[PDB]
């Protein structure tokens, strides 16, 4: 999540991020319910207050909310104990925010995002861009190994495909932000823009990337002014699932058919319907490719035709159950590397070694009756050294 991302940042970058007022408002908005009040309280105050007082302002009931919000803001480093005054920059910058100091767009965003997904799968008709190709490949969801040949999709790439467009886009931006620092792009500049969007050379490159994903659109030959799309700030289903492992996809887009074809066999193609059968051969292939069963049920669940919505569960339980069993069937044998110790002549010392292995956290399985245990090879030397020491 967005708040998750801010927490995983250094104090130096955070204070830099708390620049123009719009950022402080953006970070303020995500304060869950309580801390928003606390921010307003100690906003006009220039003198730190005791930590005990904050604790006693929340009734015993719903006390857990008092601590969790406090921990969240401590992570955000909004205030400091100073022994709980807010950051002088945040207080000042926030005070600036607090009285101080269309239909075409959505279609464009949906289409431009789709072509990226088209490229993700082996779709010959997809947008081609060297920067985009290396972006996805370096994003951890694609791999080429040969610049001349088009890249394939990694194990995580297939899972990314099934995720809903909101989470599908957000995960991509989250990966984009992390790699921005590695490639030499300042994280604060891009991160600050995203917040300001919700309402320089680095931005110009960043804006071009955002234009490529379809989140932003200048419409005026790349003018200074841009018009963000709906997805930039941050739909009815079409699949009918039958009890006999049949999917009737009411799809006109080639991408959705490509998605459904990942984990099912396509039988017939009609302009507003495609007949797909969820055969165990396909699903096992989909699971082998990297997909997780929960995603398949979720992917079919979210794109559920309205007719199935009235039924509960919308997906017939046997289909959902059967898909899971197909997943669990593959992993019947849980392979786990380890080192086995037998011929435990020292029965008394076997327990001592057992206790030592447990303390180190290396032991995986043990059998007291047979006086044997298995330890991962990583810790094999440690136990081997312990045995040699005697």
């Amino acid at each position: 999540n967005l708040q998750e991302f801010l927490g995983g940042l250094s104090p130096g970058v955070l204070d830099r991020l708390y620049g123009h007022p719009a950022t402080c408002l953006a970070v303020f908005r995500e304060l869950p319910s309580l801390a928003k009040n606390w921010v307003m309280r100690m906003l006009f105050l220039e003198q730190p207050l005791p930590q005990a007082a904050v604790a006693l302002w929340v009734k015993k009931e719903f006390s857990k909310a008092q601590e969790e919000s406090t921990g969240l803001l401590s992570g955000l480093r909004i205030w400091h104990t100073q022994l709980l005054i807010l950051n002088p920059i945040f207080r000042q910058n926030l005070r600036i925010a607090l009285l101080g100091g269309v239909p075409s767009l959505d279609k464009y965003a949906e289409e431009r995002w789709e072509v990226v997904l088209h490229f993700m799968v082996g779709s010959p008709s997809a947008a081609v861009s060297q920067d985009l190709a290396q972006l996805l490949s370096q994003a951890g969801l694609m791999k080429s190994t040969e610049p001349g040949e088009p890249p394939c999709i990694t194990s995580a790439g297939f899972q990314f495909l099934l995720l809903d467009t909101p989470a599908q886009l957000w995960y991509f931006m989250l990966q984009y932000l992390q790699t921005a620092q590695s490639r030499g792009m300042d994280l604060v500049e891009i991160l600050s823009f995203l917040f300001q969007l919700s309402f320089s050379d680095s931005l110009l490159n960043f804006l071009q990337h955002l234009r490529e994903f379809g989140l932003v659109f200048q419409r005026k030959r790349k003018s200074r002014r841009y018009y963000p799309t709906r997805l930039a700030i941050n739909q009815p289903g079409f699949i009918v699932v039958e009890t006999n492992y049949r999917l009737y996809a009411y799809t006109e887009s080639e991408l959705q058919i490509a998605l459904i074809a990942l984990f099912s066999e396509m039988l017939y193609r009609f302009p507003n319907m495609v007949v797909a059968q969820v055969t165990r051969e396909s699903v096992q292939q989909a699971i082998a490719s990297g997909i997780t069963a929960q995603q398949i049920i979720h992917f079919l669940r979210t794109r559920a035709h309205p007719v199935m919505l009235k039924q509960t569960p919308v997906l017939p339980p046997t289909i959902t159950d059967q898909i899971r069993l197909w997943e669990l069937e593959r992993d019947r044998l849980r392979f786990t590397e380890g080192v086995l110790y037998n011929q435990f002549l020292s029965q008394v010392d076997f327990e001592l070694l057992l206790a030592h292995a447990r303390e180190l956290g290396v032991l995986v399985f043990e059998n007291s009756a047979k006086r044997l245990m298995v330890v991962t090879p990583a810790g094999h030397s440690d136990v081997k050294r312990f045995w040699k020491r005697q």
């Binding site: 069963a293 929960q294 899971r324 069993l325 997943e327 669990l328």
Partner: peptide, 15 residues
């Protein structure tokens, strides 16, 4: 009033 058994009523799959 003679409700269905647990196994038939709700899924028994671990997942």
């Amino acid at each position: 009033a003679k409700e269905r058994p647990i196994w038939l009523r709700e899924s028994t799959v671990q997942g």
